[PDB]
Write an enzyme that holds these catalytic residues in place. Structure first.
Site, PDB file in Angstrom:
ATOM      1  CD  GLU A  98      -1.253  -2.676   1.252  1.00 10.59           C
ATOM      2  OE1 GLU A  98      -0.302  -2.919   2.038  1.00 10.59           O
ATOM      3  OE2 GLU A  98      -1.693  -3.566   0.510  1.00 10.59           O
ATOM      4  CG  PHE A 174      -3.100 -12.702  -1.549  1.00 10.53           C
ATOM      5  CD1 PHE A 174      -4.256 -13.407  -1.063  1.00 10.53           C
ATOM      6  CD2 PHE A 174      -3.200 -12.021  -2.794  1.00 10.53           C
ATOM      7  CE1 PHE A 174      -5.489 -13.446  -1.796  1.00 10.53           C
ATOM      8  CE2 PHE A 174      -4.423 -12.050  -3.556  1.00 10.53           C
ATOM      9  CZ  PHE A 174      -5.568 -12.763  -3.047  1.00 10.53           C
ATOM     10  CD  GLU A 179       3.175 -10.614  -0.100  1.00 12.37           C
ATOM     11  OE1 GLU A 179       2.831 -10.974   1.047  1.00 12.37           O
ATOM     12  OE2 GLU A 179       3.072  -9.440  -0.499  1.00 12.37           O
TER      13      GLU A 179
HETATM   14  N1  LIG Z   1      -7.944  -0.621   3.691  1.00 14.40           N
HETATM   15  C1  LIG Z   1      -7.737  -1.778   3.046  1.00 14.40           C
HETATM   16  N2  LIG Z   1      -7.175  -1.823   1.820  1.00 14.40           N
HETATM   17  C2  LIG Z   1      -6.970  -2.981   1.185  1.00 14.40           C
HETATM   18  N3  LIG Z   1      -7.309  -4.151   1.718  1.00 14.40           N
HETATM   19  C3  LIG Z   1      -7.880  -4.197   2.941  1.00 14.40           C
HETATM   20  C4  LIG Z   1      -8.103  -2.991   3.629  1.00 14.40           C
HETATM   21  N4  LIG Z   1      -8.665  -3.276   4.792  1.00 14.40           N
HETATM   22  C5  LIG Z   1      -8.793  -4.603   4.834  1.00 14.40           C
HETATM   23 BR1  LIG Z   1      -9.562  -5.486   6.338  1.00 14.40          BR
HETATM   24  N5  LIG Z   1      -8.315  -5.200   3.728  1.00 14.40           N
HETATM   25  C6  LIG Z   1      -8.340  -6.733   3.444  1.00 14.40           C
HETATM   26  O1  LIG Z   1      -7.139  -7.611   3.446  1.00 14.40           O
HETATM   27  C7  LIG Z   1      -7.602  -8.803   2.691  1.00 14.40           C
HETATM   28  C8  LIG Z   1      -6.592  -9.957   2.290  1.00 14.40           C
HETATM   29  O2  LIG Z   1      -5.423 -10.036   3.144  1.00 14.40           O
HETATM   30  P1  LIG Z   1      -5.140 -11.194   4.280  1.00 14.40           P
HETATM   31  O3  LIG Z   1      -6.014 -12.379   4.195  1.00 14.40           O
HETATM   32  O4  LIG Z   1      -5.289 -10.429   5.686  1.00 14.40           O
HETATM   33  O5  LIG Z   1      -3.552 -11.611   4.151  1.00 14.40           O
HETATM   34  P2  LIG Z   1      -2.808 -12.061   2.723  1.00 14.40           P
HETATM   35  O6  LIG Z   1      -3.530 -13.167   2.052  1.00 14.40           O
HETATM   36  O7  LIG Z   1      -1.224 -12.422   3.055  1.00 14.40           O
HETATM   37  O8  LIG Z   1      -2.802 -10.766   1.741  1.00 14.40           O
HETATM   38  C9  LIG Z   1      -2.069  -9.608   2.116  1.00 14.40           C
HETATM   39  C10 LIG Z   1      -0.659  -9.600   1.481  1.00 14.40           C
HETATM   40  O9  LIG Z   1      -0.717  -9.361   0.026  1.00 14.40           O
HETATM   41  C11 LIG Z   1      -0.777  -7.915  -0.112  1.00 14.40           C
HETATM   42  C12 LIG Z   1       0.268  -7.431   0.916  1.00 14.40           C
HETATM   43  O10 LIG Z   1       1.603  -7.559   0.374  1.00 14.40           O
HETATM   44  C13 LIG Z   1       0.079  -8.396   2.108  1.00 14.40           C
HETATM   45  O11 LIG Z   1       1.332  -8.803   2.713  1.00 14.40           O
HETATM   46  C14 LIG Z   1      -8.193  -8.133   1.428  1.00 14.40           C
HETATM   47  O12 LIG Z   1      -9.047  -9.018   0.666  1.00 14.40           O
HETATM   48  C15 LIG Z   1      -8.984  -6.954   2.041  1.00 14.40           C
HETATM   49  O13 LIG Z   1     -10.380  -7.259   2.180  1.00 14.40           O
END
Ligand SMILES: Nc1ncnc2c1nc(Br)n2[C@@H]1O[C@H](COP(=O)(O)OP(=O)(O)OC[C@H]2OC[C@H](O)[C@@H]2O)[C@@H](O)[C@H]1O
Ligand SMILES: Nc1ncnc2c1nc(Br)n2[C@@H]1O[C@H](COP(=O)(O)OP(=O)(O)OC[C@H]2OC[C@H](O)[C@@H]2O)[C@@H](O)[C@H]1O
Ligand SMILES: [Cl-]
EC number: 3.2.2.-
Lengths: 250, 252
Positions: A98, A174, A179
């Protein structure tokens, strides 16, 4: 599921704001101008059925938009959006996806193709679940890959240790999919921060379960590994939002 | 010798668009003017004028147009504590700050000034802060703060540095003293001071003494309620995250 109003303007407005005023001393500017970036971003999905994408579709866009990322500063997170970002403190302590230009330009936005003019939808997008995985994850999946692939030095990973449902580390997340396995030999260490939510039953500890599994993956990838559960600096941040929690006792 | 922001218009427009479609959607309302109109309003305020030819009414039209209704009990004013107030207010999750409003967000950190020649503004140089008269240098942010303060409702919060031997918590000539406090209206019911005492520094300002006592009396003369707290735990924890070993951050 309603797509974002005036996507191009939003894209270009963020791109331009970022360009001139954001992360100046933290991250480097990028070569291609904002119109160049739009073209690459938009050719990926436009004029196609919304499910018509794969992991290659946004490639050119991420090549153009990948910034060099500072040694030792890159962070990954799973399941702890708000805490990882409060603590990464807008590029000040760590970079998150982000904070990077593509992450920042598309963060929270919703958009999709349609075969017919103007080539994207402005009423409805389909539920991601309806599209093949490689279309669902085309954009954030490859964004994750490109980010991971540029990291150097130490990397940090913030997890949830308090979810009985989702374990801390998961191959299917993810971090698991895009990653950890794209980390190059420029990476020297993975430093896991296990987040234990306050007043909630502790699920995952270091040296155990999914955190053991990852320790093994991390070492098998030839990296050094460390792991800490609620280090005082994070603990405090959790404590400003629930000061009476026993964990924050004076 | 101060360098202005490049592509001012494009930066304005970018931020205004971003804001409109995507920022604070559930927290602050949209304005009715579109970005181009708000720019017109902004620009005419200072364009084709001595960089120093500005008074408290120059941006009147821009703010009228730019002013959102602010939600009950969430407005916050800050002194000498930028990072701490904004971390604490947490992007309008807990309080709103000027910087979360539309005009605040569009202009935050930007540097600009007019020139009488084509094309109305300078992109090369802008004058030493300290050359222009008080009314001209405070023309944009002065009016911004007046208008924000004028729109506040319910209970306002004021976060202040109490560890500055050179600068009192409350000063008749700060922005709060000059532009916020005097524009609090009958919509406002209480002023809630938060005195921030920096970790490992001498405490200088205390509730019920010095300039804070003066403030208390001014607030009550205006028929608002008053409280004042010093390092409330939630704020303390914020400071402690940046300095965990500090004496004041001991646990169990
Ligand atoms: N303001 C916002 N802006 C954006 N998203 C927001 C949000 N608020 C929320 Br709440 N999410 C949510 O977080 C959910 C999936 O993440 P995860 O399951 O917690 O972890 P990962 O699979 O590892 O993916 C993360 C990795 O890849 C990207 C980055 O490099 C990180 O390390 C999303 O579907 C959103 O709904
Ligand atoms: N990142 C940034 N971007 C932009 N500007 C930044 C900035 N960081 C700083 Br730091 N300022 C500047 O600090 C100056 C005076 O602040 P002060 O001496 O601590 O207290 P006051 O005189 O009482 O005014 C406070 C009132 O201003 C409006 C807000 O509602 C608040 O209540 C401001 O005018 C900023 O120009
Ligand atoms: Cl609590």
């Amino acid at each position: 599921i309603v797509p974002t109003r005036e996507l191009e303007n939003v894209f270009l407005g963020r791109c331009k704001d970022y360009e001139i005023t954001r992360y100046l001393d933290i991250l480097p500017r990028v070569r291609s101008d904002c119109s160049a970036l739009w073209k690459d971003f938009f050719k990926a999905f436009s004029f196609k059925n919304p499910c018509d994408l794969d992991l290659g579709s946004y490639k050119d866009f991420f090549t153009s938009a990948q910034q060099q990322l500072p040694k030792n500063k890159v962070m990954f997170w799973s399941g702890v959006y708000d805490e990882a970002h409060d603590y990464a403190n807008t590029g000040r302590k760590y970079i998150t996806l982000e904070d990077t230009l593509p992450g920042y330009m598309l963060n929270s936005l919703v958009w999709c193709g349609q075969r017919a003019n103007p080539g994207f939808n402005e009423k409805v997008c389909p539920d991601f679940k309806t599209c093949p995985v490689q279309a669902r994850e085309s954009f954030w999946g490859m964004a994750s890959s490109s980010y991971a692939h540029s990291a150097e030095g130490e990397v940090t990973y913030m997890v949830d240790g308090s979810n009985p449902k989702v374990p801390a580390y998961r191959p299917d997340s993810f971090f698991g999919k895009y990653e950890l396995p794209n980390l190059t030999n420029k990476v020297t260490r993975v430093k896991v921060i296990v987040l234990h939510r306050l007043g909630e039953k502790i699920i995952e500890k270091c040296g155990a379960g999914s955190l053991l599994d990852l320790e093994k993956l991390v070492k098998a990838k030839h990296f050094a590994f460390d792991c800490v559960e609620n280090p005082r600096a994070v603990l405090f941040l959790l404590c400003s939002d629930n000061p009476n929690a026993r964990e924050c006792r004076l």
